[PDB]
Amino acid sequence: SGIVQQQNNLLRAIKAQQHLLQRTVWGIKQLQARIL
Amino acid sequence: SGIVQQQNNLLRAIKAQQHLLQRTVWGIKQLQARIL
Amino acid sequence: GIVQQQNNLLRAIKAQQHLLQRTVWGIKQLQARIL
Amino acid sequence: ELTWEEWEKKIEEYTKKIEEILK
Amino acid sequence: TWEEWEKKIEEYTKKIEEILK
Amino acid sequence: LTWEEWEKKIEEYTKKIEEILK
């Protein structure tokens, strides 16, 4: 709840969003391979 | 604009990027269902 | 420090925004190809 | 039930909402 | 596998929603 | 923009982000 904890929290959200984003990249590449 | 104001900015941007991510997931799943 | 950590998060979010745009572009490409 | 064109606009809405928060 | 992929999506998704409470 | 230029741009920004979380 302090500023330090919240910065640690935002870092963790970005780290988890980076994993989500990577999995979406893999999905697009898969479809692109099947379509093309 | 200061550390507190910058932290609220980052939080708000991360929250809206999550909305973006969810919608890209929905788009991939739509294509995937249609293709397969 | 906190200032250098906030600058780090800003840069990471901005570059992650670049990523999202290009994955949007890919979905739109495939979608236009199908329809 | 959301339609591709409603999907495209929601992307733009939130995208611009991001640029405004950073810029 | 798309089944593998689907699970990881809902794993990381709920992890994020828990982080943004 | 080719799908090959897309893949590189992804990996480019991908390594740029992970390096930020060093």
Numbering used by the authors:
A (entry chain E), B (entry chain D): 35 to 70
C (entry chain F): 36 to 70
D (entry chain I): 114 to 136
E (entry chain G): 116 to 136
F (entry chain H): 115 to 136
Paper text:
To this end, the peptide N36 with the E49K and L57R substitutions (designated N36KR) was synthesized and used to assemble the complex with HP23L for crystallization. The sequence of N36KR was built from Ser-35 to Leu-70 on two chains and from Gly-36 to Leu-70 on another chain of the N36KR trimer; the sequence of HP23L was built from Thr-116 to Lys-136 on one chain and from Leu-115 to Lys-136 on the second chain and from Glu-114 to Lys-136 on the third chain of the N36 trimer. However, the Lys-49 in the structure of HP23L/N36KR destroyed the salt bridge with His-53 thus damaged indirectly the hydrogen bond between His-53 on N36KR and Tyr-127 on inhibitor contributing the resistance. Further, the positively charged Lys-49 repelled away the side chain of the same charged Lys-136 located at the extreme C-terminus of HP23L, which markedly impaired the binding of the inhibitors thus conferring the resistance. So the E49K mutation, together with its upstream His-53, downstream Arg-46 and Lys-136 on HP23L, greatly increased the positively charged repulsion near the mutation site, eventually resulting in instability of the 6-HB structure. However, the substitution of L57R dramatically disrupted the hydrophobic interactions between Leu-115 and Leu-57. Moreover, the positively charged residue Arg-57 on N36KR attracted the negatively charged residue Glu-118 on inhibitors, which resulted in the side chain of Glu-118 twisted its dihedral angle Ψ by nearly 180°, thus failing to form the hydrogen bond with the Thr-116. The disruption of three major hydrogen bonds in the hook region extremely decreased the NHR-binding stability of the inhibitors thus contributing the resistance.
